[PDB]
Short mmCIF file of all heavy atoms in Angstrom, two decimals:
data_model
loop_
_atom_site.label_atom_id
_atom_site.label_comp_id
_atom_site.label_asym_id
_atom_site.label_seq_id
_atom_site.Cartn_x
_atom_site.Cartn_y
_atom_site.Cartn_z
N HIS D 169 -8.63 -24.34 23.89
CA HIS D 169 -7.39 -23.51 23.63
C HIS D 169 -7.46 -22.05 24.16
O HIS D 169 -8.46 -21.35 23.99
CB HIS D 169 -7.01 -23.53 22.21
CG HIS D 169 -6.66 -24.91 21.63
ND1 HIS D 169 -7.57 -25.78 21.10
CD2 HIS D 169 -5.45 -25.55 21.47
CE1 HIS D 169 -7.09 -26.79 20.66
NE2 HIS D 169 -5.78 -26.79 20.96
N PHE D 170 -6.39 -21.74 24.76
CA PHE D 170 -6.27 -20.29 25.38
C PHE D 170 -5.00 -19.76 25.26
O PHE D 170 -4.10 -20.55 24.64
CB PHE D 170 -6.44 -20.57 26.94
CG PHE D 170 -7.68 -21.16 27.34
CD1 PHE D 170 -7.90 -22.56 27.43
CD2 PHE D 170 -8.89 -20.43 27.55
CE1 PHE D 170 -9.12 -23.20 27.76
CE2 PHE D 170 -10.12 -20.83 27.84
CZ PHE D 170 -10.26 -22.38 28.09
N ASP D 171 -4.66 -18.62 25.47
CA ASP D 171 -3.21 -18.17 25.58
C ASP D 171 -3.07 -17.09 26.75
O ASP D 171 -2.82 -16.00 26.48
CB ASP D 171 -2.80 -17.43 24.26
CG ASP D 171 -1.15 -17.50 23.95
OD1 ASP D 171 -0.55 -16.74 24.71
OD2 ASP D 171 -0.79 -18.16 23.10
N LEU D 172 -3.07 -17.59 27.93
CA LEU D 172 -3.04 -16.84 28.97
C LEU D 172 -1.79 -16.88 29.83
O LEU D 172 -1.28 -18.12 30.01
CB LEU D 172 -4.40 -16.89 30.00
CG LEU D 172 -5.49 -16.38 29.61
CD1 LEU D 172 -6.79 -16.98 30.33
CD2 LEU D 172 -5.48 -14.80 29.67
N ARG D 173 -1.18 -15.81 30.38
CA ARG D 173 -0.06 -15.80 31.24
C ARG D 173 -0.29 -16.63 32.50
O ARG D 173 -1.20 -16.21 33.17
CB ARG D 173 0.36 -14.43 31.57
CG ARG D 173 0.69 -13.48 30.54
CD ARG D 173 1.57 -12.27 30.88
NE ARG D 173 3.05 -12.71 30.81
CZ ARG D 173 4.07 -11.87 30.88
NH1 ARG D 173 3.95 -10.61 31.00
NH2 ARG D 173 5.31 -12.31 30.82
N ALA D 174 0.38 -17.74 32.59
CA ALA D 174 0.46 -18.50 33.81
C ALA D 174 1.11 -17.75 35.04
O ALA D 174 2.15 -18.07 35.46
CB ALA D 174 1.24 -19.64 33.55
N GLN D 175 0.38 -16.57 35.47
CA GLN D 175 0.78 -15.73 36.60
C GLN D 175 -0.50 -15.06 37.24
O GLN D 175 -1.53 -15.07 36.70
CB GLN D 175 1.88 -14.69 36.38
CG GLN D 175 2.48 -14.54 34.95
CD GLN D 175 3.95 -15.06 34.73
OE1 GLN D 175 4.29 -15.80 33.87
NE2 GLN D 175 4.77 -14.40 35.57
N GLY D 176 -0.46 -14.52 38.48
CA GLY D 176 -1.40 -13.80 38.97
C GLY D 176 -2.66 -14.64 39.45
O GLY D 176 -2.54 -15.83 39.33
N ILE D 177 -3.68 -14.13 40.14
CA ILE D 177 -4.76 -14.78 40.58
C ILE D 177 -5.75 -15.17 39.46
O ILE D 177 -6.50 -14.28 38.96
CB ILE D 177 -5.55 -14.29 41.72
CG1 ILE D 177 -4.81 -14.51 42.91
CG2 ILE D 177 -6.87 -14.92 41.84
CD1 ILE D 177 -4.70 -13.31 43.99
N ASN D 178 -5.85 -16.50 38.97
CA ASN D 178 -6.82 -16.83 37.99
C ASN D 178 -8.06 -17.54 38.50
O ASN D 178 -7.97 -18.18 39.43
CB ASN D 178 -6.18 -17.68 36.94
CG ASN D 178 -4.96 -17.08 36.18
OD1 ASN D 178 -5.28 -16.47 35.18
ND2 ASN D 178 -3.74 -17.10 36.69
N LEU D 179 -9.17 -17.12 37.95
CA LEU D 179 -10.50 -17.94 38.26
C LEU D 179 -10.94 -18.73 36.98
O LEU D 179 -11.15 -18.21 36.02
CB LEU D 179 -11.56 -16.84 38.68
CG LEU D 179 -13.01 -17.04 38.30
CD1 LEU D 179 -13.57 -18.38 38.72
CD2 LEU D 179 -13.90 -15.93 38.92
N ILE D 180 -11.01 -20.01 37.20
CA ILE D 180 -11.64 -20.95 36.23
C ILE D 180 -13.05 -21.34 36.56
O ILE D 180 -13.46 -21.61 37.65
CB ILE D 180 -10.90 -22.18 36.17
CG1 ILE D 180 -9.34 -21.97 35.86
CG2 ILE D 180 -11.49 -23.13 35.06
CD1 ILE D 180 -8.54 -21.84 37.07
N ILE D 181 -13.89 -21.35 35.47
CA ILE D 181 -15.28 -21.72 35.64
C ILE D 181 -15.81 -22.77 34.51
O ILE D 181 -15.69 -22.31 33.40
CB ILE D 181 -16.22 -20.52 35.82
CG1 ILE D 181 -15.61 -19.55 36.81
CG2 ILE D 181 -17.53 -20.99 36.35
CD1 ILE D 181 -16.44 -18.36 37.16
N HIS D 182 -16.34 -23.70 34.88
CA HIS D 182 -17.11 -24.66 33.98
C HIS D 182 -18.52 -24.66 34.20
O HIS D 182 -18.93 -25.00 35.34
CB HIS D 182 -16.42 -26.01 34.03
CG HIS D 182 -17.08 -27.03 33.10
ND1 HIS D 182 -17.32 -26.77 31.71
CD2 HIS D 182 -17.27 -28.42 33.29
CE1 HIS D 182 -17.86 -27.89 31.17
NE2 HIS D 182 -17.78 -28.82 32.09
N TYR D 183 -19.37 -24.01 33.31
CA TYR D 183 -20.73 -23.69 33.59
C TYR D 183 -21.66 -24.00 32.48
O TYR D 183 -21.13 -24.32 31.34
CB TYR D 183 -20.83 -22.17 33.98
CG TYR D 183 -20.35 -21.21 32.84
CD1 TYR D 183 -21.21 -20.86 31.91
CD2 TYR D 183 -18.95 -20.88 32.81
CE1 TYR D 183 -20.73 -20.07 30.74
CE2 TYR D 183 -18.46 -19.99 31.81
CZ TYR D 183 -19.41 -19.52 30.85
OH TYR D 183 -19.00 -18.84 29.88
N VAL D 184 -22.83 -23.64 32.63
CA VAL D 184 -24.03 -23.85 31.54
C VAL D 184 -23.90 -22.76 30.46
O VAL D 184 -24.11 -21.57 30.85
CB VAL D 184 -25.27 -23.98 32.15
CG1 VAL D 184 -26.27 -24.24 30.92
CG2 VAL D 184 -25.37 -25.23 33.07
N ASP D 185 -23.57 -23.07 29.22
CA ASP D 185 -23.67 -22.18 28.16
C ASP D 185 -25.01 -21.67 27.77
O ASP D 185 -25.68 -22.39 27.11
CB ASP D 185 -22.92 -22.72 27.00
CG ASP D 185 -22.86 -21.80 25.82
OD1 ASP D 185 -23.62 -20.74 25.85
OD2 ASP D 185 -22.01 -22.09 24.83
N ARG D 186 -25.28 -20.43 28.18
CA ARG D 186 -26.55 -19.80 27.83
C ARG D 186 -26.40 -18.27 27.94
O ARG D 186 -25.53 -17.69 28.60
CB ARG D 186 -27.75 -20.19 28.67
CG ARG D 186 -27.73 -19.56 30.00
CD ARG D 186 -28.56 -20.50 31.00
NE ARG D 186 -28.09 -20.46 32.33
CZ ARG D 186 -28.27 -21.41 33.34
NH1 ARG D 186 -29.00 -22.49 33.09
NH2 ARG D 186 -27.75 -21.22 34.50
N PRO D 187 -27.24 -17.56 27.23
CA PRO D 187 -27.29 -16.08 27.24
C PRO D 187 -27.40 -15.53 28.69
O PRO D 187 -28.07 -15.94 29.48
CB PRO D 187 -28.48 -15.60 26.47
CG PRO D 187 -28.73 -16.77 25.44
CD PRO D 187 -28.40 -17.96 26.34
N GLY D 188 -26.34 -14.53 28.92
CA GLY D 188 -26.33 -13.87 30.25
C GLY D 188 -25.17 -14.32 31.19
O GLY D 188 -24.66 -13.64 31.88
N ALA D 189 -24.81 -15.58 30.90
CA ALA D 189 -23.62 -16.20 31.58
C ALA D 189 -22.56 -15.25 31.64
O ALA D 189 -22.04 -15.00 32.77
CB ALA D 189 -23.25 -17.44 30.76
N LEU D 190 -21.98 -14.89 30.48
CA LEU D 190 -20.78 -13.94 30.54
C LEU D 190 -21.14 -12.64 31.40
O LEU D 190 -20.32 -12.10 32.24
CB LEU D 190 -20.40 -13.58 29.19
CG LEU D 190 -19.12 -12.62 29.14
CD1 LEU D 190 -18.10 -13.01 30.13
CD2 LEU D 190 -18.62 -12.43 27.68
N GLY D 191 -22.35 -12.22 31.11
CA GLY D 191 -22.89 -10.96 31.75
C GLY D 191 -22.84 -11.04 33.22
O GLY D 191 -22.21 -10.19 33.95
N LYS D 192 -23.39 -12.11 33.74
CA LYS D 192 -23.59 -12.31 35.22
C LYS D 192 -22.18 -12.60 35.93
O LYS D 192 -22.14 -11.96 37.01
CB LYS D 192 -24.39 -13.57 35.47
CG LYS D 192 -25.84 -13.26 34.80
CD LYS D 192 -26.68 -14.51 35.17
CE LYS D 192 -28.12 -14.20 35.13
NZ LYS D 192 -28.97 -15.29 35.55
N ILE D 193 -21.29 -13.19 35.29
CA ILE D 193 -19.88 -13.46 35.80
C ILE D 193 -19.28 -12.26 36.05
O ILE D 193 -18.98 -11.77 37.30
CB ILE D 193 -19.06 -14.53 34.97
CG1 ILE D 193 -19.81 -15.76 34.82
CG2 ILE D 193 -17.65 -14.78 35.57
CD1 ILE D 193 -19.12 -16.77 33.70
N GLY D 194 -19.09 -11.34 34.95
CA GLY D 194 -18.71 -9.91 34.97
C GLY D 194 -19.38 -9.02 36.07
O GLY D 194 -18.78 -8.51 36.92
N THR D 195 -20.66 -9.05 35.92
CA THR D 195 -21.39 -8.12 36.88
C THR D 195 -21.10 -8.32 38.50
O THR D 195 -20.87 -7.32 39.19
CB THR D 195 -22.94 -8.18 36.56
OG1 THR D 195 -23.08 -7.73 35.31
CG2 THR D 195 -23.62 -7.16 37.64
N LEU D 196 -21.18 -9.59 38.77
CA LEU D 196 -20.81 -10.11 40.14
C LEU D 196 -19.41 -9.67 40.51
O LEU D 196 -19.15 -9.31 41.75
CB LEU D 196 -21.09 -11.49 40.27
CG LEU D 196 -22.58 -11.69 40.43
CD1 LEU D 196 -22.97 -13.15 40.48
CD2 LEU D 196 -23.07 -10.94 41.72
N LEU D 197 -18.39 -9.97 39.68
CA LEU D 197 -17.06 -9.60 39.91
C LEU D 197 -16.87 -8.05 39.96
O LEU D 197 -15.93 -7.68 40.88
CB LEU D 197 -16.10 -10.08 38.79
CG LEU D 197 -15.33 -11.33 38.96
CD1 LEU D 197 -15.23 -11.65 40.57
CD2 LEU D 197 -15.89 -12.54 38.38
N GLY D 198 -17.57 -7.34 39.18
CA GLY D 198 -17.37 -5.96 39.11
C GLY D 198 -17.85 -5.48 40.52
O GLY D 198 -17.14 -4.78 41.26
N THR D 199 -19.05 -5.86 40.79
CA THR D 199 -19.77 -5.46 41.91
C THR D 199 -18.89 -5.75 43.16
O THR D 199 -18.99 -4.90 44.16
CB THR D 199 -21.19 -6.25 41.95
OG1 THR D 199 -22.10 -5.45 41.25
CG2 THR D 199 -21.70 -6.50 43.40
N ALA D 200 -18.14 -6.97 43.03
CA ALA D 200 -17.22 -7.12 44.25
C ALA D 200 -15.90 -6.24 44.16
O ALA D 200 -15.10 -6.38 45.09
CB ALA D 200 -16.70 -8.67 44.41
N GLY D 201 -15.87 -5.21 43.22
CA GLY D 201 -14.76 -4.43 43.23
C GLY D 201 -13.54 -5.08 42.68
O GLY D 201 -12.47 -4.49 42.45
N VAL D 202 -13.80 -6.34 42.20
CA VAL D 202 -12.62 -7.25 41.59
C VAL D 202 -12.43 -6.75 40.19
O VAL D 202 -13.45 -6.76 39.42
CB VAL D 202 -13.02 -8.79 41.86
CG1 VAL D 202 -12.00 -9.44 40.91
CG2 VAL D 202 -13.03 -8.99 43.09
N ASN D 203 -11.22 -6.50 39.80
CA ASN D 203 -10.85 -6.02 38.47
C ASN D 203 -10.39 -7.14 37.62
O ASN D 203 -9.53 -7.92 38.23
CB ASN D 203 -9.82 -4.91 38.45
CG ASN D 203 -9.40 -4.42 36.93
OD1 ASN D 203 -9.98 -3.54 36.33
ND2 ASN D 203 -8.33 -5.21 36.49
N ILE D 204 -10.78 -7.36 36.43
CA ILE D 204 -10.32 -8.48 35.61
C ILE D 204 -9.18 -7.99 34.59
O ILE D 204 -9.35 -6.82 34.09
CB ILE D 204 -11.42 -9.12 34.75
CG1 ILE D 204 -12.74 -9.32 35.51
CG2 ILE D 204 -10.86 -10.35 34.06
CD1 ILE D 204 -13.97 -9.71 34.62
N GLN D 205 -8.03 -8.73 34.66
CA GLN D 205 -6.95 -8.31 33.75
C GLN D 205 -6.85 -8.76 32.39
O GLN D 205 -6.46 -8.26 31.39
CB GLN D 205 -5.59 -8.76 34.41
CG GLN D 205 -5.19 -7.83 35.59
CD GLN D 205 -4.19 -8.51 36.51
OE1 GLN D 205 -3.70 -9.56 36.13
NE2 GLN D 205 -3.88 -7.99 37.72
N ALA D 206 -7.35 -10.03 32.19
CA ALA D 206 -7.56 -10.76 30.87
C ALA D 206 -8.48 -11.83 31.15
O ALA D 206 -8.80 -12.31 32.28
CB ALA D 206 -6.10 -11.22 30.58
N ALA D 207 -8.94 -12.38 30.04
CA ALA D 207 -9.81 -13.55 30.19
C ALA D 207 -10.27 -13.93 28.83
O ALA D 207 -10.15 -13.25 27.82
CB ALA D 207 -11.24 -13.04 30.88
N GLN D 208 -10.66 -15.26 28.84
CA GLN D 208 -10.92 -15.93 27.54
C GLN D 208 -11.85 -17.05 27.92
O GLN D 208 -11.79 -17.64 28.93
CB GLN D 208 -9.60 -16.50 26.88
CG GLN D 208 -8.38 -15.61 26.98
CD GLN D 208 -7.23 -15.96 25.90
OE1 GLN D 208 -6.38 -16.76 26.23
NE2 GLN D 208 -7.31 -15.34 24.75
N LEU D 209 -12.91 -17.26 27.07
CA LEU D 209 -13.88 -18.36 27.38
C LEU D 209 -14.22 -19.02 25.94
O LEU D 209 -13.98 -18.25 24.91
CB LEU D 209 -15.11 -17.82 27.94
CG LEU D 209 -16.50 -17.49 27.23
CD1 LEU D 209 -16.30 -16.34 26.26
CD2 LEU D 209 -17.18 -18.79 26.71
N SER D 210 -14.54 -20.24 26.02
CA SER D 210 -15.06 -20.95 24.69
C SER D 210 -16.05 -21.85 24.96
O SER D 210 -16.16 -22.33 25.98
CB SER D 210 -13.77 -21.50 23.97
OG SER D 210 -13.10 -22.54 24.77
N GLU D 211 -16.98 -22.01 23.91
CA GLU D 211 -17.98 -23.02 24.04
C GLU D 211 -17.30 -24.27 23.87
O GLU D 211 -16.24 -24.44 23.23
CB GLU D 211 -19.08 -22.84 23.00
CG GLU D 211 -18.49 -22.78 21.59
CD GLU D 211 -19.75 -22.59 20.59
OE1 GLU D 211 -20.81 -22.42 20.96
OE2 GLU D 211 -19.31 -22.71 19.38
N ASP D 212 -17.83 -25.27 24.53
CA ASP D 212 -17.26 -26.67 24.64
C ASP D 212 -17.53 -27.36 23.32
O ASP D 212 -18.18 -27.10 22.42
CB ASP D 212 -17.80 -27.47 25.78
CG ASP D 212 -17.49 -26.66 27.14
OD1 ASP D 212 -16.74 -25.77 27.24
OD2 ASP D 212 -18.34 -27.06 28.17
N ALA D 213 -16.72 -28.59 23.23
CA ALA D 213 -16.69 -29.38 22.02
C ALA D 213 -18.18 -29.79 21.81
O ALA D 213 -18.74 -29.63 20.68
CB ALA D 213 -15.84 -30.55 22.12
N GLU D 214 -18.80 -30.57 22.72
CA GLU D 214 -20.09 -31.27 22.53
C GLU D 214 -21.16 -30.86 23.65
O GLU D 214 -22.33 -30.83 23.32
CB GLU D 214 -19.88 -32.70 22.29
CG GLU D 214 -21.07 -33.54 21.99
CD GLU D 214 -21.70 -33.15 20.63
OE1 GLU D 214 -22.02 -32.02 20.39
OE2 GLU D 214 -22.08 -34.04 19.83
N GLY D 215 -20.62 -30.70 24.75
CA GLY D 215 -21.60 -30.38 25.96
C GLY D 215 -22.49 -29.10 25.83
O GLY D 215 -22.41 -28.26 24.99
N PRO D 216 -23.46 -29.07 26.72
CA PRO D 216 -24.34 -27.87 26.66
C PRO D 216 -23.67 -26.72 27.51
O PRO D 216 -24.39 -25.75 27.88
CB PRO D 216 -25.67 -28.29 27.36
CG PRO D 216 -25.28 -29.31 28.37
CD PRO D 216 -24.00 -29.91 27.90
N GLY D 217 -22.35 -26.82 27.65
CA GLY D 217 -21.69 -25.99 28.58
C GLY D 217 -20.52 -25.22 27.94
O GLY D 217 -20.29 -25.37 26.62
N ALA D 218 -19.86 -24.44 28.68
CA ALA D 218 -18.81 -23.50 28.18
C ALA D 218 -17.80 -23.19 29.36
O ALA D 218 -18.07 -23.41 30.47
CB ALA D 218 -19.47 -22.17 27.82
N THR D 219 -16.64 -22.86 28.96
CA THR D 219 -15.51 -22.81 30.02
C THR D 219 -15.06 -21.44 30.01
O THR D 219 -15.38 -20.61 29.05
CB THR D 219 -14.42 -23.67 29.57
OG1 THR D 219 -14.84 -24.88 29.18
CG2 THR D 219 -13.37 -23.76 30.78
#
Side-chain angles (χ1 to χ4, degrees):
Chain D
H169 298 85
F170 297 95
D171 205 288
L172 284 165
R173 305 202 82 165
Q175 6 250 126
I177 283 139
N178 292 274
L179 139 62
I180 304 88
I181 314 187
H182 180 34
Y183 60 87
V184 177
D185 179 346
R186 75 204 149 197
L190 178 45
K192 304 181 155 185
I193 302 171
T195 298
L196 283 178
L197 257 336
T199 273
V202 175
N203 174 95
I204 317 173
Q205 284 164 6
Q208 318 198 273
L209 100 296
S210 53
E211 58 181 2
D212 300 339
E214 183 67 306
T219 313

